[PDB]
Amino acid sequence: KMRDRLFFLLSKYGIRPRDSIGQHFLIIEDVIEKAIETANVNENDVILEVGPGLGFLTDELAKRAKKVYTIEIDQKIIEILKKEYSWNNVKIIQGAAVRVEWPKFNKVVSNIPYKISSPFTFKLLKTDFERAVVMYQLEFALRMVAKPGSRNYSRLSLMAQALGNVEIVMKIGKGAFYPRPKVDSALVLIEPRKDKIVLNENLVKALFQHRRKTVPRALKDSIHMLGVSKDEIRGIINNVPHSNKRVFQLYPEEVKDIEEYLKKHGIIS
Ligand SMILES: CSC[C@H]1O[C@@H](n2cnc3c(N)ncnc32)[C@H](O)[C@@H]1O
Ligand SMILES: [Zn+2]
CATH class of the missing domain: 3.40.50.150 (Vaccinia Virus protein VP39)
Incomplete structure (x- = not known):
């Protein structure tokens, strides 16, 4: 009809x-x-x-x-x-x-x-x-x-x-x-979700520039060195959660670990 x-x-x-x-x-x-x-x-x-x-x-x-x-x-x-x-x-x-x-x-x-x-x-x-x-x-x-x-x-x-x-x-x-x-x-x-997962938008975007990069490298590369030196970053790099994974393997849950990890190290807010 x-x-x-x-x-x-x-x-x-x-x-x-x-x-x-x-x-x-x-x-x-x-x-x-x-x-x-x-x-x-x-x-x-x-x-x-x-x-x-x-x-x-x-x-x-x-x-x-x-x-x-x-x-x-x-x-x-x-x-x-x-x-x-x-x-x-x-x-x-x-x-x-x-x-x-x-x-x-x-x-x-x-x-x-x-x-x-x-x-x-x-x-x-x-x-x-x-x-x-x-x-x-x-x-x-x-x-x-x-x-x-x-x-x-x-x-x-x-x-x-x-x-x-x-x-x-x-x-x-x-x-x-x-x-x-x-x-x-x-x-x-x-x-x-009844309780959302509130990701930093900029971070999410920084990582997914090249989404088949390992988290350590996708951060190394979109570390805008926001007033931060080299021996600390290439330390901070090492301990970033999921420093095994490629960005595109990350669950939201795990973008958050990185988020607060980074936060608790002085790096975005
Ligand atoms: C659902 S059939 C496609 C319809 O979407 C409309 N459409 C296409 N692009 C846009 C847009 N950017 N904003 C609003 N309607 C749109 C078209 O004019 C058509 O009527
Ligand atoms: Zn790429």
Whole structure:
């Protein structure tokens, strides 16, 4: 139904779906019914969607969530909503959710596009939220859930898992979109740890400059010698926790040991 309900809004309004802003458009109901479920959206929820499009997942959010803020950037799309859909608890904004200043929200539900997967998720970790269901280009979402020491374990992996609990729920065939995307979708859940692990951002970044470096060397190299001499550092080097491991093998737990180790030696705060 939705399959055919797209096509009567397609050339009803007339956008060429550009992959300049990752315009692929979802058309499977058993994929909206799994996110909305996963999020468990009740009527006390201040939601955040991003890149609503022509809003079928936006739709479901209305008929549950308390307040839905949504952010779209194709000023054409922004309007197509208002005519095609009369919503009583919706709130659309102009801009790229990248930079625009965000409302209040406890949950998030959105298909995040390829170009803004990375900076988005980051901003999103510095926020309160009870919960986050988010759709991703598979390559990225695997990246989120990577285990320590795995092929692709990234700063993002650390940072995400440090805050919360990152489960892939369903992979999603590109057969769900017109246009068909180049790669598959996947669905990530984020439940923030009851007690977070609060890493120094700068440190985390210093280490992950070259993430396949041994901790001793990734520190040697991003020791900005912040007012510190040589015989002390190349001592302090030796005893840094996990001076075996390559940076990309570190668990968040262990980034913290290093953190306080360094802290308790005079080196960042
Ligand atoms: C979910 S289908 C893709 C949708 O995401 C929107 N989109 C792409 N990039 C951004 C962005 N930076 N901010 C907000 N919406 C975006 C596109 O305009 C399209 O409607
Ligand atoms: Zn390197």
